[model samples]
Target: GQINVSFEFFPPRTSEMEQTLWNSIDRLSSLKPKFVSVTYGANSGERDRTHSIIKGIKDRTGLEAAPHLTCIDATPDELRTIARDYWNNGIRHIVALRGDLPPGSGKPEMYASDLVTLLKEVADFDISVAAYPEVHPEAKSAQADLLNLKRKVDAGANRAITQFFFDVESYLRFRDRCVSAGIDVEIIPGILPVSNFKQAKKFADMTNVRIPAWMAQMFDGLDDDAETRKLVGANIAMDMVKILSREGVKDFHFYTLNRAEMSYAICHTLGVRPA
Candidate 1:
């Protein structure tokens, strides 16, 4: 009863993927999560798709849907207009990010903190900012990342959602450091259940996230069986929830990867029943 959960999904591009996303949405909506967020993309069409998907979810399920808004590709005026439109359309929450800039892209004038401030100037939106439990790959140091988070909070971020991680201890320790640094916001640990080890490994390697050796062994020698891998992934996610909840961490944010089954299995096991 003390537990809370949220889900994240990317705006699907293809029709088939859109069907899968809506199916996942229908399945997870019954759990009555605190909210669900859609990730934003770099270009115009993708950005429009994110807005429509967010709108679609809200219209279909009446859930509080958040759209990821970044300062990556738009000017300040453009960003302000987008923020104004979202607020006018009844969207009250956003996940603010300083999205990735490709190499040869010039230095960014607006950071995540700026985005938070911009959104605040537009309207009083409940803003969610990103945190890196294992330290962001581009950060100068863990302390620097902590300071960056502090800056975002000072700029009006309402909460911080961490990068998805498997190492429970790392998240606990990061929570400790956030406290010591005076970041007065809930740092919800992002959970990504690993059903496909190869793709997960690739993601982890690229982002400097550490996948535990034990987890590797758990998935090892199961390459030929997709069903087996899904089972293992479900077990790992539930085990994580058990341990994290025991530590009095009440809230969790799932990176659903547009697949409801894995997240659904874990939530049901955690006793997150339909309300």
Candidate 2:
């Protein structure tokens, strides 16, 4: 069976970063993923750059491009205009989210409103919402987060991509809860292959992604050995995907972090070959 996979990227902020990102894009675009998504920065601050990169992917590659849409700093009219732009450009898939608060900021403050309201206001396209398998840091509990997810799905989102988690049981339990609640949207696991352990740990902390202690030990003391680190990371990611595939999960969304090697290696391990 052919599995569906998507990769998520953020826009490059510097010339060096630009080159690295394009090199990554050129490499991974060969895998023929179901789609590749570009993420909007917190508060929609990098909206233009995100759009530009997504447009480039669409124009230059044979892959489908899905740009993330965030409601953190956007008014209803502004969101509608952005959605219209995507529609006009022939992009029908959108990863809709109430983006996180900016770095160093406290809990996100809605504009005297709610996430479901925002989702309803921007329901003009085929939308995917965010889910947290390990529970959102801001949510009261996993059950509470599941309820919020149901709210988003009922508000017309057609799919949910989860926040990255290292524990397979967490995801399985979350999937069961979704089924019990009758929220039938596709719940794709967002996989992060740690290219850099220290930085990845920092990102996990920032996103409230719980990194299992055993996984941390696997990357221990490899800071100076980049090649070994990459190999270890690739194996770790492939192991997780293999286990998930055996468990009847067919769809995967990789958080590529704008890099190529680890993701390409993991896909190869999963038998995804270039056409």
Candidate 3:
């Protein structure tokens, strides 16, 4: 009846990052979020690192952890083993992705569609696949992109988690297109907290996310004003989430980028609380 919120985290690379990651987990865990996920990078050893913290997230806070499983650089057998391991260990949800490739590596034999089929055959995992409301950069066109997404959903991905976008109109139009394509899975809009202008730009640039000219100047001259930037990021995030929910969106996914305060503030702003 109300909005469902979740978060994404990446494996921490250092002890300092580990402390901060857990602090974030502790801070937001009580929201009893729909679930939280941990992502592994293209060249990082965070593959196994994700499994380690997957258990920790559950042990420490009783929250379900959906660690990302991608075919960026892994073979079918490699990912199958990890998927089976998670299934046997009582894990049921997975965030399936064709992760961004490393600097100079060949793409995997299994795009996310292949991984989705392989994982479903291995276990009854509730797989979530990535969706691009703005269209995947590598995709030839919007038509081709929606077809690819349809293939994943047809292959058994249970949910579609969108790439982050700033404007509600973008998501609304994309959602209409997906539905018209006969894709019936739920689309969970990915809300990227306005952590910082530069931080947002890093992924925005890569993903082809548009920052309209007006939105681009949001952080102009605020680099030295860390406190002010953070304040604005939080307020923007809250407003974004609320706006989406009021527009008939029931589910939201967040790209937390390992921050505690902003994520906590947004959840609290949404009236999400533990029972």
Candidate 4:
């Protein structure tokens, strides 16, 4: 009941989806998320779209909207200018990441730690970096991944939001390792409510996330039943939150996927209600 929660949303593509994203933010605004984040994509129009939504969220809902910043292709000077502009505009929170490089893209000149350092130099903004409970797919080893997280934090990252995973034990163990490694920031778990098992499975396969066998069984026969699928997905999220909450986790970062019903329901069950 005392948990803090945040949400992550992607930049919507179409006008209709943009409206849907706004509506979703409005619906979840009552629950009082710590902050809502909008993702930055590597494509041409997606970056500007992220800024548009971030400004819109602040204007409409008066929520602290964090824009995801990545060190994929932008030059250091460009990123510095962007961070300075964000601080000048009163935007304080940032989710920094070493974003994926698209096919045929050149080598990344900066990493998340470098981005964090740059942001901190630009201003005293609150920054969050990415963490992987199941070691990063590209990392040399689990220990190396943990050290990368330490580097980000050492570079002044305020917290780390993990990639979504179904294995709670994995997250718990990762948290333990973070502590052992002297990482003293919130390791916020990213929760993804999976209403479409097949779709989530495919995404998980691409990422380092592991979908538990039991979850596969739960969604096995619900192919044609969308309503039931939502219910099942919501339950999984609720159970995960409860378990983590009991283990002394105060904040959860939900990957809303630009839809809010499942996140809203999960928050409602966690005693996070309208003020």
TM per candidate comes to: 0.98, 0.92, 0.96, 0.97
lDDT of 1: 0.93
Q: Which tens-of-lDDT digit does each residue in 1-275 have in candidate 1?
A: 67889999998889999999999999999999999999998878999999999999999999999999988878889999989999999998999999978677579777899999988999999999999999999888989999999999999999999998989999999999999999999999999998899999999998889999999999999998999999998999899989999998899899998999999988997889787
- Model 2 pairs whose backbones collide: none
Q: Cα miss at 39, model 3 (Å)?
A: 0.3
Deviation in Å, model 4, residue 31 alpha carbon: 0.9
Local distance difference test, each candidate: 0.93, 0.82, 0.86, 0.91
Candidate with the larger lDDT of 3 and 4 = 4
lDDT of 2 at 242: 92
Model 4 Cα lDDT, one tens digit per residue, 1-275? 56899999999989899888989999999999999999999986999999889999999989999999998868889899999888888788999998987879487567889999989988999999999999999899998989999999999999999999999999999999999999999899999988988999999999978888888999999999999999899889899988998898889898888898999988887889898
Q: Which ten residues in a row are the worst by lDDT in model 1?
A: 101-110
lDDT for model 2 comes to: 0.82
Sorted on TM-score, highest at the top, how do the candidates line up?
1, 4, 3, 2
Show model 2 residue runs off by greater than 4 Å.
43-45, 103-124
State the lDDT at 4 in candidate 4. Answer: 90
Clashes of each: 0, 0, 0, 0
Q: What are the per-residue Cα lDDT tens digits for candidate 2 across 43-87? A: 344788998898899999957899887766667777777776777
